[PDB]
Amino acid sequence: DLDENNFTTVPLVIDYVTPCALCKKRSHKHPHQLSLENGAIRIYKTGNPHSCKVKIVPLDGNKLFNIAQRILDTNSVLLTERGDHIVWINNSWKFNSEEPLITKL
Amino acid sequence: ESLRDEEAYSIVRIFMDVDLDACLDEIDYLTAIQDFIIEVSNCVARFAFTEC
Ligand SMILES: [Zn+2]
Numbered sequence: 001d002l003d004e005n006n007f008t009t010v011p012l013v014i015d016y017v018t019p020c021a022l023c024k025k026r027s028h029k030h031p032h033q034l035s036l037e038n039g040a041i042r043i044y045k046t047g048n049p050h051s052c053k054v055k056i057v058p059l060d061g062n063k064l065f066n067i068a069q070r071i072l073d074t075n076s077v078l079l080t081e082r083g084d085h086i087v088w089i090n091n092s093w094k095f096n097s098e099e100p101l102i103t104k105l
Numbered sequence: 106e107s108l109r110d111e112e113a114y115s116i117v118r119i120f121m122d123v124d125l126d127a128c129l130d131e132i133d134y135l136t137a138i139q140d141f142i143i144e145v146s147n148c149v150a151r152f153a154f155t156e157c
Contacts, residue, residue: 035132044132054135 008036011046023052076105119149 001010011031019026023045030046039060045052071077076088086095087105094101108114129137 042132042136044135049131049135054132054139056136 007041008034012043020052022055025051028052071105077102121145 002012011033013031016027020028028045029048029051032052033044033046035042035044039058041057041059042054043057044054078086080086080095084095084097085100085102086093087101088094089101089105108117123141
């Protein structure tokens with residue numbers, strides 16, 4: 001239901017089968033709320049805020065860090081027990097201590 | 106409140122005084138107090154570990 005312009009406007013209603021990870025309560029009184037401020041999405045409770053805690057989620061950018069995370073999410077680079085990095089290139093798991101292959105990957 | 110004796114009952118609790126000449130709303134107050142608690146507890150614990 002949330003899109004680019006309603007994300008700070010509509011409360012968020014959840015199914016309280018499990019306790020809230022923030023307030024340790026079985027079922028909350030009111031739906032939670034989202035807010036945007038200086039590049040961080042803040043989620044809190046509505047009604048009596050002191051009933052629950054507040055959570056901050058940061059989003060800043062860093063194209064290069066995002067690229068690194070996306071590359072890491074494909075499980076193409078792995079670290080072994082001995083400490084060498086193995087990469088998945090051209091249908092093979094390759095490692096080479098003297099010639100690094102992360103840049104090739 | 107004060108201390109009647111500084112030679113035997115020097116034992117006290119950890120306490121702080123904060124006064125900010127401004128008004129904050131509920132959400133900013135809550136995030137600020139969370140961060141304050143974390144920072145101050147870490148600083149005091151590090152001092153205790155490294156000196157006491
Ligand atoms: Zn909660």
